[PDB]
């Protein structure tokens, strides 16, 4: 599985899945990603992200 945020692969037996209000689903590999997302930042605008890269 890939992180629906930064793009990197999610180490099996790890990460969290956030279930949005409408039922959507976002798989995060770490708190760092969740926390940037919570700040309203978009992964493509963050240079360190695979997505961005």
């Amino acid at each position: 599985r890939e992180c629906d945020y930064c793009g990197t692969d999610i180490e099996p037996g790890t990460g969290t899945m956030f279930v949005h209000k409408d039922g959507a689903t976002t798989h995060f590999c770490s708190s760092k990603c969740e926390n940037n997302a919570d700040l309203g930042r978009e992964a493509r605008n963050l240079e360190w992200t695979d997505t961005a890269r």
């Binding site: 180490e11 099996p12 037996g13 790890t14």
Partner: protein
């Protein structure tokens, strides 16, 4: 109305003092059943990682499915069963009678013992077999030691020495079995004793925390609300009633916490191998890299990384064995991060 409430902490692990031997000492051994065999082994704790296993439990709704399981990596290189001690039965319990030693000793066993230069293995054996003839022979055990040198992550070279009982068929047969091991050179491994999937009891001296107060040491409450601002935050209400006019040893007080021997029952052995498959990227934090004989124990094990841990076939297993669990993945992701 003064609601009930269990007491704070167990009264069965005391006194809560510093352990006398850092090397754990079992106070019980498995029962005698199968062919003779050493009833224990030892290794050094390295760290933890996780693995993904195929569910074994034939009574589980998830049988045959992926399951992530925490694992503690223990380096378990070969040990040397260096001697055979015999115990005789006496009106005052079991007492050491004699020992049968060898000739080949690891190059550094002399960092702990005064290795034998002149010994007579036959007079000793004779005395032992005579004791068996007389019927005054108590259990049989092997003087065993580890080879720290084979473990780079562990600084020590001074071997750790422990006695491990030999159980098995008939005494005559295991007595012979014991002598065999010893005489060789004593070299034996984790395989010779355990098989992946079996349950072992692990013993170790817990991580030390020096002096700690009742809240941390015994799990008593902290003062609450307004009671926490008057000058007392982490002190118990009182040391006892007016009478008896003395403080009972049962009231939670400050003192040594940690560095106590503990025997953790029924730890499932997930995998016994050798190499660097379980090792972690960057190296296990505060330990080093694993590349050699190792054992993956399910869950946690007492003690800090590098401490000597001891294994023994579980003496009170709750479940039946499900040998060689299928490991589909062993995490090697860095433990820093």
């Amino acid at each position: 109305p003064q609601p009930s409430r269990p007491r704070k902490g167990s009264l069965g692990f005391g006194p809560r003092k510093r352990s006398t031997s850092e090397t754990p000492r079992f106070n019980s051994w498995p029962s005698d059943d199968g062919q003779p065999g050493v009833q224990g082994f030892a290794g050094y704790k390295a760290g933890m990682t996780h693995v993904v296993l195929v569910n074994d439990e034939p009574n589980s709704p998830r049988e045959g499915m992926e399951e992530t399981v925490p694992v503690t990596v223990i380096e378990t290189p070969p040990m040397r069963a260096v001697a055979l001690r015999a115990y005789e039965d006496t009106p005052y319990g079991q007492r050491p009678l004699t020992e049968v030693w060898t000739d080949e000793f690891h190059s550094e066993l002399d960092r702990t013992l005064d290795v034998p230069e002149d010994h007579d293995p036959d007079a000793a054996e004779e005395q032992i077999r005579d004791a068996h003839e007389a019927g005054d022979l108590g259990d049989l055990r092997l003087i065993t030691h580890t080879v720290p040198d084979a473990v780079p992550s562990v600084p020590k070279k001074k071997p750790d020495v422990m006695e491990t009982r030999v159980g098995g068929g008939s005494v005559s047969d295991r007595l012979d079995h014991a002598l065999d091991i010893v005489e060789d050179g004593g070299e034996h491994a984790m395989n010779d004793i355990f098989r992946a999937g079996e349950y072992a009891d692990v013993a170790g001296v817990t991580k030390g925390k020096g002096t700690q107060g009742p809240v941390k040491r015994w799990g008593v409450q902290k003062r609450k609300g307004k009671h926490a601002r008057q000058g007392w935050r982490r002190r118990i209400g009182n040391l006892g009633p007016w009478n008896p006019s003395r403080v009972r040893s049962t009231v939670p007080q400050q003192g040594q916490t940690g560095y106590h021997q503990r025997t953790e029952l029924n730890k499932r052995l997930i995998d016994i191998g050798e190499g660097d498959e379980p090792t972690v990227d960057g190296g296990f934090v505060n330990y080093g890299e694993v590349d050699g004989p190792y054992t993956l124990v399910k869950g946690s094990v007492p003690g800090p990384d590098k401490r000597l841990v001891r294994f023994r076939p579980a003496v009170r297993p709750n479940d039946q064995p499900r040998l060689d669990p299928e490991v589909r993945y062993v995490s090697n992701e860095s433990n820093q991060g």
